Paper text:
Here, we present the structure of WcbL from Burkholderia pseudomallei. A critical step in the synthesis of heptoses is their 1-O phosphorylation, mediated by kinases such as HldE or WcbL. We report that WcbL operates through a sequential ordered Bi-Bi mechanism, loading the heptose first and then ATP. The protein forms a head-to-tail dimer, with the two active sites facing away from the dimer interface, in line with the native molecular weight predicted from size-exclusion chromatography.
Residue numbers in the entry:
A (entry chain B), B (entry chain B): 2 to 346
Amino acid sequence: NPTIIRARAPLRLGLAGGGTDVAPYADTFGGYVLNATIDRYAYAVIKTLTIPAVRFVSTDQQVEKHQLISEPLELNGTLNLHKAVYNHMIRNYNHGKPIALELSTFCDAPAGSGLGSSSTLVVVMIKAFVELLNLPLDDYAIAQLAYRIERVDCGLAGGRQDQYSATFGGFNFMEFYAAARTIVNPLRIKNWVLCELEASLVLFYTGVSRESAKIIQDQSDNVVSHKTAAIEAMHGIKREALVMKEALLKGDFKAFVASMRLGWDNKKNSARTVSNAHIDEIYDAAIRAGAQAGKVSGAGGGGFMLFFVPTEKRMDLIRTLGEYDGQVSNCHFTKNGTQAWRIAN
Amino acid sequence: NPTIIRARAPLRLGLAGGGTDVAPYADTFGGYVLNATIDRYAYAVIKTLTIPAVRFVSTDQQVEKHQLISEPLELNGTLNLHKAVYNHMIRNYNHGKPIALELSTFCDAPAGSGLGSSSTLVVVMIKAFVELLNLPLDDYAIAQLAYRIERVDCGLAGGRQDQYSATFGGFNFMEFYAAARTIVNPLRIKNWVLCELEASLVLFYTGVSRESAKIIQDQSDNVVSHKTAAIEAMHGIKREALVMKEALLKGDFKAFVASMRLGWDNKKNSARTVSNAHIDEIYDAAIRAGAQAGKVSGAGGGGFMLFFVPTEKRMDLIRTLGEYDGQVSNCHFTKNGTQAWRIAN
Ligand SMILES: [Cl-]
Ligand SMILES: [Cl-]
Ligand SMILES: [Cl-]
Ligand SMILES: [Cl-]
Ligand SMILES: [Cl-]
Ligand SMILES: [Cl-]
Ligand SMILES: [Cl-]
Ligand SMILES: [Cl-]
Ligand SMILES: [Cl-]
Ligand SMILES: [Cl-]
């Protein structure tokens, strides 16, 4: 009888520091990122098959089907991450002997939403295989493996923060250093601070961003080509991540919003397409309505925005965002990282 | 220096049984309701004032301001629930001596959303006063007090389930009997069942319902005027609440969806405006896309719908709902009931 396994991993809001985790900056100066997992998930499912075949199904419902062969699967550009995860697991834990299965993914947010879905989907595929094969991989190992698969095996350029949020869960302050060295600091935030933060945050989905790869490229170029003003903006991103971390540990909401404002200026000045006329218009309207600070969650150029608003202006801000193109939602944080369960066998 | 208190209480999805908690049915036959709190909240805030005044602010930003007087506040039709909570608390715990404060509310969903916000807002106002005055009210007492304030003091007709979800939190099966007797059964659902359910539910907000008071009136009339077929539909609502409860405890998803389907037919047959052409169109399209069952969350006539969809059809259902008028979201349950925190003093 077939085995059915599912895994999920929470998506994440980038609170501060994003951009300092791009390869040249982190390797040169050290990066800081403060992020927190929310109540939206990426999912993977493994179904063992009774036919000699392997099948891959994606979130946007692309589908590939291959015969069971004893060579690694080619990374031909269709579903490369699915195939690279499968390839690593067969080679390293099944002695190169293929397994007949279907590996499928789905997600509560599309790519370019700014919630780290791309890397979270790699994590959850890994977790589904950890459960299938009973592997002793710890959280650092899962996060590092996800990074290797996406950035090396599949050669996709990007950041370092999303693998860690997806694996560990909760509020984390991450330190990124040269030679793939990362330190995760789980933040033990007081219950009243978490409730006050949730009561003060409004999310707004502005549509899919098509700028992430560009922004990351520009930020990497700032360091390589010595663009002094742009590197200094990045230095500001880094400083304010620490300021925001300490404000949360101290329950200091005045310092939290001051740091988000400074951080948002810095982020916009680090790469040309982080914001635009359309985002700035939403941002200006939110401030007019009573929001104190805000930012694009991910790399920039669209996707989710978050706003900090005092509770007496919250409904006014919700009403105002109603006039603009996008979807309003509340913000609820999750403490758990990636997890798996079984349905058959 | 002023004291600032906030409280929140989670909103709820009606899974089964709704309608059997209307006064004539529950009092005559006994009602059953299965519900579960989600990641959306109603909030109340108390701010002590340094001027001799009392101020009330609502979710839709109505505002009333009164001089500090030693008579109960009149329930003139503007912000009656706010005033009735304040009145009860001053009379019963402050010896009839007024307190200078501002009592404000806000909510993650508007009235008529089908998530129990009206009664949840009464609960959260009560909780804010429990925290202000350090009252020893237990959960049964908070739920009963909320019911009395809304239904008796303020004479607003309605159900019995929302007070209990808002106060207790989590998944509960409630038994409603004559003489205001209610038994709350917290369901201790297995972790894999909760994850599988979340992975299988899609929410869809269709807009504000204006039918709730009408549906509840019609359901109450079915019993009083002996409308045999309509009472029998209500008997079916009740039966299937129990079937669904037991399916969750057993992790039996086949029985869960079969019961939701039967329950939805029953609910539509119990009152004429529970569904309509527009809801049926969304429902039919969801089924076409691969959903197995679904229902309006609250009394009916609009508000939130929920769909059960096998994971392999989830993205297809999300895409399809995209074609219709309303907002798609995931479903994440919360285990905690109402809670409070302090900001100043
Ligand atoms: Cl960031
Ligand atoms: Cl995918
Ligand atoms: Cl994303
Ligand atoms: Cl992202
Ligand atoms: Cl970010
Ligand atoms: Cl119901
Ligand atoms: Cl209100
Ligand atoms: Cl509601
Ligand atoms: Cl409701
Ligand atoms: Cl209901």
